[PDB]
Design an enzyme around this catalytic site. Structure first.
Site, PDB file in Angstrom:
ATOM      1  N   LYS A  65      71.577  86.477  60.128  1.00 39.53           N
ATOM      2  CA  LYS A  65      72.363  85.470  60.864  1.00 39.53           C
ATOM      3  C   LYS A  65      73.621  86.132  61.450  1.00 39.53           C
ATOM      4  O   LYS A  65      74.388  86.811  60.765  1.00 39.53           O
ATOM      5  CB  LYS A  65      72.830  84.382  59.897  1.00 39.53           C
ATOM      6  CG  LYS A  65      73.605  83.190  60.572  1.00 39.53           C
ATOM      7  CD  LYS A  65      72.642  82.165  61.168  1.00 39.53           C
ATOM      8  CE  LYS A  65      73.271  81.078  62.029  1.00 39.53           C
ATOM      9  NZ  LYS A  65      73.692  81.692  63.260  1.00 39.53           N
ATOM     10  N   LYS A 101      73.726  90.978  63.745  1.00 43.63           N
ATOM     11  CA  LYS A 101      74.684  90.955  64.831  1.00 43.63           C
ATOM     12  C   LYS A 101      74.017  91.680  66.013  1.00 43.63           C
ATOM     13  O   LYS A 101      73.189  92.590  65.829  1.00 43.63           O
ATOM     14  CB  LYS A 101      76.025  91.615  64.353  1.00 43.63           C
ATOM     15  CG  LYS A 101      77.228  91.494  65.285  1.00 43.63           C
ATOM     16  CD  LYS A 101      77.818  90.039  65.393  1.00 43.63           C
ATOM     17  CE  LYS A 101      79.075  89.717  64.553  1.00 43.63           C
ATOM     18  NZ  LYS A 101      79.692  88.338  64.738  1.00 43.63           N
ATOM     19  N   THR A 185      86.490  75.915  61.184  1.00 45.41           N
ATOM     20  CA  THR A 185      87.237  77.056  60.665  1.00 45.41           C
ATOM     21  C   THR A 185      88.598  76.632  60.104  1.00 45.41           C
ATOM     22  O   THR A 185      88.930  76.978  58.961  1.00 45.41           O
ATOM     23  CB  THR A 185      87.462  78.109  61.694  1.00 45.41           C
ATOM     24  OG1 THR A 185      86.198  78.598  62.095  1.00 45.41           O
ATOM     25  CG2 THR A 185      88.245  79.243  61.119  1.00 45.41           C
ATOM     26  N   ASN A 216      95.856  76.365  68.456  1.00 47.99           N
ATOM     27  CA  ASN A 216      94.833  75.479  67.859  1.00 47.99           C
ATOM     28  C   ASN A 216      94.772  75.520  66.333  1.00 47.99           C
ATOM     29  O   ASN A 216      94.734  74.478  65.664  1.00 47.99           O
ATOM     30  CB  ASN A 216      93.454  75.848  68.431  1.00 47.99           C
ATOM     31  CG  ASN A 216      93.243  75.341  69.873  1.00 47.99           C
ATOM     32  OD1 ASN A 216      92.098  75.235  70.333  1.00 47.99           O
ATOM     33  ND2 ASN A 216      94.339  75.023  70.581  1.00 47.99           N
ATOM     34  N   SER A 340      77.658  76.726  61.204  1.00 53.54           N
ATOM     35  CA  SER A 340      76.599  77.320  61.969  1.00 53.54           C
ATOM     36  C   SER A 340      75.290  77.349  61.110  1.00 53.54           C
ATOM     37  O   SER A 340      74.226  76.946  61.554  1.00 53.54           O
ATOM     38  CB  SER A 340      77.046  78.644  62.542  1.00 53.54           C
ATOM     39  OG  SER A 340      76.355  79.712  61.944  1.00 53.54           O
TER      40      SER A 340
END
Lengths: 406, 409, 395, 418, 409
Positions: A65, A101, A185, A216, A340
């Site tokens: 992943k 990746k 996050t 943010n 995710s």
């Protein structure tokens, strides 16, 4: 270099867990590294052949992943190294995944939408034999987004003759994306404050907190902390920091921003804002903010990294010895990778969870990851950073043993 | 023989359910039976060819499910019989499965770890064509364990080029195993006690209970009952049994228990097993061994509730005598169903790629057991038969009904 | 036979010993790699559902996919199916086919079953065993009470399961479904070829050879003709009632004492038919043909062959002489693989080079190990699988 | 136009008519016809393609798989504005017939896309071809249904479709589609396959009328690929080609036309007659005296109010459907030897079969080998339909259909379908 | 014609959404339309060849989904037309599916059970290359039912060599059917009534409701409303209307209704069905009979809330009239969406291997229907259209966005 720095971290972590060297020899390079050449019809009518990569580090626990990057500096060494890091994060959030990746060497800023589409589809067609919902599940990363994901999902679904949403995460909602992705996050950062603060006796409502960065990430932690009945003693941005022992006016400071420090007098420097008195210090961005110079002056009982390696190796050592609770970035920022994962579970079911359900499942994961890393740090008398790394490769290590590989 | 008496249970369960003979010709043998020959390189350099079996009884309801035995007394008929037994267990917990079972004729006790891995991998390579997550899902059994499951999962996943955890249950947690596996069977037994008491008007808190056996099984049970309130009177072991009209002190014995489930042999006065069985109480749980309750013993049991834990503790005639008297007998094909249930739950988690907490597993386990208790109870009442036959009827029913809907018979 | 499985295992054992393999090779070969038993529900014309027991034994696939027929018979049983699959392995070895042996059967009686019922059982068998069968795995064929219509039904069913026409799954198909030309004479052709090669070895010509031919049915007439047309003397013919022996040669085309004297009468070639024990150790010393060719099965006793081989007579065993059958069935599969179909003439010709190579290699093996041809056949038979199993690292 | 769509439907009805009779004459009860009259599978697809001007256009495509009793289906794909379902179905039935006639292990498949390739770029054509494969890939492939070129498609379209199919599958899949370039698993013989087949049929017919080919006088209608390759074969054989035509008119010359000059002078399109002044019309050309008339252009050219005027003793149909049921009856009545389209043109599918065989093996044949195998298929196919017509006392077209469905009908029976 | 009518609905929904013509050209016709010929052996020995269809409208959002009809008037255009309607239903319930639909031209009323099994398997074998759990998932429709589904499921599973429950919905519970399917549709109607009431500021306990029809749909509604505290002031059956502005004694009327939903003939004070539509009230629930509210009676409706149950009961002109008069019309395609929604849930359960209780199903269902009502309500407001046109817009919108994200148009 990054690659070598990543190798040494895995060697130490495995060494501390009690593994002999063969486990390092297994873990030190990916199981599989694929390099591809991808021809793409450019708008000006030429054909350009791009170089792409996909590294699948270790699939003992489950399929691999991780994100795919579109960037001119992408390279093979880097892609392997980031795949190893993804393994660690999968171990941290206890995900049934190994790390993967990819990347392509290109510059998306000088490319049209069509060219980017064509390259995205060429990437999927180049690597399809080794990738899929049961094998290797990509995601957004540098210069890729939900659109690129949509196109890769479409191409993959055509190759296969059935819709395959589970191949790739970060999708648009209507293509089987997850709710709760935008603040995943930052939400886990907050849950890590809640659990750190329990360990140190403070009640959250009584907590005095300093936060660097007011984009943010910073502002979300700001508002959360204010709305919890805590006192955001300190704020900061590119210009500098505001300190105020009573608690800053976060509703007002939120109401004017881009970000905010400039319109006030008595603006201190980020350096001195770090040494101020507080329970919790949260530095944003910026590598090596807290160093061997600073470390002895940090007053916080709890440091929660929210990025990017802001504490040096020496500083981490100092604060550990001085008994401050350092929650590392690799644990604190793990919500992203967690939702995710959740998107992929939902694709497995063909059933989509509400915002709230995603948030409940998120916190149970973060709370459990915090505890394992803490109990690990205690039981091996190490900092929570080394402890995070141990709980990172540990799953894959135990999986690989059980499966008869080493 | 196990086979023949297994076919006799099926024949009668189906007859009571009102099916004609063709349903029985379908159920009496398995749909498929594969026997394989597996060469394995032994540590001493020689090559030994093992005989392997896999029986898949009926998959009308779903894929076949069941464990793999390694033992020198494994044979084809046993494996067939036990696959039929799996079908009844599946039916009883309402699992979306039919019964499967496997075995290798071997003696794991005289083999190394490496020989056992090589045998484990050879078995999967020999049977790969007819097993997997949507077809036939194995599990541990006699002398196989989570490590055998890990090696079997690995081999299968390499054959297919992707991780396949749902091939096989009883895996280690890090390979997709489930929380809750360790106490699944014992938890199941305690829920059957709670429900059995609800049907005899007794309150859990006030129930007085005897438990023959003090290994892992018996101990868990005493602990639970104590903590609930109930007075745990009788408590047997290999050697003999304590008694006391009022509650024995459970904490005392729990601590100073022998490793191998032995107390009593260090105590004052102490009756034999046979006398313990005939004492007075609400609930008797003959944990441990076989034929504890016979034609003889039968009229002397004072329990209003007999909860079987281990297999075979009560004869066919005993079970008749007990049903005569109005004693609620909970057969162990029901009471021990928690094991098969959490093995199912692991497969579900593998399917979704998403793993449950031990509390979720516990809460789901109890709701399956409650439901299974009620439906076996109401079919006993409805058809005026005892809980054992009622259990057999509900075990085979689902497969029977599915086979009919699918047009097979 | 009766202990067909025990009895075939003994042969395998002795052949593997003579090849020089340790006993672990025999452990591997004594039992099939896979044996599958299935229960197959079938709707009967009268509305009832009857459930059948079916079997498929796949002996050893070291060399290639397994190959062999399915029979429908009341006396089918598991051990017999396994015994027969091992025999297939041997035939595959003898013809050097890139196959191992397989067999199936169903316990039933086709004689009391309708066409519709046999079609439904046939599809049922296929659906029951599909997971372990097909063109790259295990390719069935006709056998006792199965024919080309049964093959057609089975092929059709397998193709549906797969979503594409799969003619290579099963041989003996009708021509229009991808069957092979050359099938009806393949067995009998192969026997004539064995005569031609045997003759060559005794230093005698075909047109000068003198042939006694026991049995005068479908089997023995084809050979009686062939030999005439080749210019040789059909010195002895025979059937039920007696037998006609003419040292001039019999009037074969027009032809369109007791047997026990006839077999000992003087000639070059003696060819029996169908029934067994025609040559015992009573007849074995008195036989005067220099070449005995088994057209059909079990005519020479286990001893009758010892005696004969002791004293110079070249005996062609049925298992070799009859391999054309298995050979044309393979060729059908090759054509399926290619999607390209061969003429009668191309098939005849490839069948002949197969039989010529098999005769030589079995002769040479009989010579280098000094044993008769039967044992030599058995040996060349399992040797391929054995070699293949060894190279593949299995034992 | 209604006219063209009316012609498309009638072609389907008329083929159903003859097939019904064929099956009856072959001894089958009504139910076999019910199986054969329509395809096992008809797929209709909508395919979105990004056009050069930035817009997206959604195309209709079709794939008809008539019957696969005998083998996978086989037949080309056309790109043409007049593509329609009915005509695609009919053509798929013709393909079954060609395959039975040539004795191939295939049944009939056909596709098309409603588009006009004359006004599209190469890029757009590539994208449409790839989209067609992506739309139909579930029902097509080497073991299922194997396409090929047809009207406005060529070996380049075949290469793009093979490439896309191979990517969907993750391995090179040459046997998916025939008519490919040599370097992609193409076959020797393909470019001339149809015309070479037509010319073998002309060589056999001429023996039946005791004419020497050298001495034969031929009118070929149509100077497209088919007609031009054929005019060359005839000219090389020494026959006198006294008639030629394209879209605008025909040239007739009882001395013999100068075919090398015409072939040098012709267009990409296959036009040439504009360069001359005395251009008669096709209608008129069809009636001129000759030994051999070859309709090699469009359908419905020999009709009822017409067939009595044809002067040829041999009519060899290169093109599909140039002669009506009623024309066929008149021609048969007058003693004309008719070589029907499904026979005459079987050489293309014959060599496309060989391509597929060579793909299945992964081994390629020389040009001589294909040429020898083609000849022997076509000589054998001609004699078998000629003797079927003689023994059953039917016209050559009925005989062609009988020999064409026989195998599929038998195979469907053996398989338990009817 | 159904086909043209449904095309012009799509063209309008898409135009109001703001999409250009190229989206309409993508949506106006199915991505795939398959027509098959299926030879079936009849009881009498003949072979009959049936024509079947399967239309897969659009799979941008996920696999396609919808029933199969057996009916003499089945044709290609109807099947396509109906596949488009399923897309709308799927977009309305926010299902991760596009629409599909099938039919076979046959008369099942003149066919035996064996013949229907054979046809069913034959249809599955004919279309298997384009269908399955990840591709295209059928369901019951006109003259098909869970027995048909079980046959198709069986056949498909045999083709694949594994149990494939997720291929097809509407299955018997023993083959992986879902609970909650019997009342799915009816529950959704009642949830829509609860939502409409909130938007019109009326408390449910204060609502007055006329319900046409006293069958299972009507009597269910009536009970629900009565038990919710509302007043049911008008009921009807085939024979006529009962009206009482103080409220009817629903418990009484439920006990006296017969097995055919008849009552009103036990009463001498009956009015006509046509009179009842015009009686004063808050909520009107018309009969599942088409064109009850035409243009001739539409100004006389006094309900401020009209909930369509089923069957297109109010004509196109009536519904604009009602929108002009500020009546809240809840369109049938929304109100009846619980049907498609329980079919989806069955599929989810199949994917998991894990089956839900009737109450978990009831709860997820409610949640979907609440969100759909809200999302259609908000989109009717922001575009100033009624709830019908906004249902349609919400309908294709998800497939339109999905198709653009994926790069199709």
């Amino acid at each position: 270099n990054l690659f070598l720095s990543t190798q040494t971290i895995i060697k130490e972590a495995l060494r501390k867990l009690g593994y002999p060297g063969d486990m390092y020899e297994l873990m030190k390079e990916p199981q599989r590294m694929l390099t591809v050449r991808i021809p793409v019809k450019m708008d000006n009518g030429s054909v350009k052949v791009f170089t792409g990569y996909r590294s699948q580090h270790n699939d003992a626990v489950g399929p691999t992943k991780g994100g795919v990057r579109f960037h001119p500096e992408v390279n093979e060494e880097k892609v392997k190294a980031l795949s190893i890091w993804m393994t660690l994060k999968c171990g941290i959030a206890n995900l049934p995944y190994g790390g993967g990746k990819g990347g392509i060497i290109c510059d998306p800023r000088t490319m049209s939408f069509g060219e980017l589409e064509r390259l995205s589809r060429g990437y999927v067609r180049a690597i399809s034999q080794i990738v899929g919902p049961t094998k290797d599940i990509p995601a957004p990363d540098v210069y890729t987004n939900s659109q690129i994901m949509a196109w890769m999902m479409d191409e993959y679904s055509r190759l296969r003759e059935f819709d395959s949403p589970g191949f790739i995460t970060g999708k648009p909602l209507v293509l089987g994306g997850s709710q709760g992705r935008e603040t995943a996050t930052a939400q886990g950062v907050t849950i890590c404050i809640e659990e750190a603060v329990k360990k140190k006796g403070i009640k959250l409502q009584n907590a005095r907190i300093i936060i660097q960065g007011f984009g943010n990430a910073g502002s979300f932690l700001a508002k959360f902390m204010h709305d919890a009945g805590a006192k955001v003693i300190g704020i900061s941005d590119a210009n500098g920091g505001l300190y105020n022992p009573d608690g800053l006016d976060i509703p007002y400071l939120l109401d004017k921003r881009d970000m905010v420090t400039n319109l006030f007098t008595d603006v201190i420097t980020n350096e001195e804002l770090l040494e101020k008195d507080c329970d919790i210090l949260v530095p944003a961005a910026i590598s090596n903010q807290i160093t061997a110079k600073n470390a002895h002056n940090i007053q916080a009982s709890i440091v929660v990294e929210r990025a990017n390696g802001p504490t040096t190796i020496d500083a981490t050592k100092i604060l550990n010895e001085r008994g401050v609770l350092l929650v590392p970035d690799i644990l604190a920022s793990a919500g992203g990778v967690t939702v995710s994962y959740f998107e992929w579970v939902q694709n497995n079911q063909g059933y989509y969870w509400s915002e709230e359900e995603v948030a409940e499942k998120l916190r149970s994961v973060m709370v459990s990851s915090f505890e394992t890393i803490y109990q690990t740090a205690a039981t091996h008398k190490v900092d929570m950073r080394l402890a995070a790394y141990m709980t990172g490769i540990r799953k894959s290590a135990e999986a690989s043993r059980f499966r008869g590989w080493v």
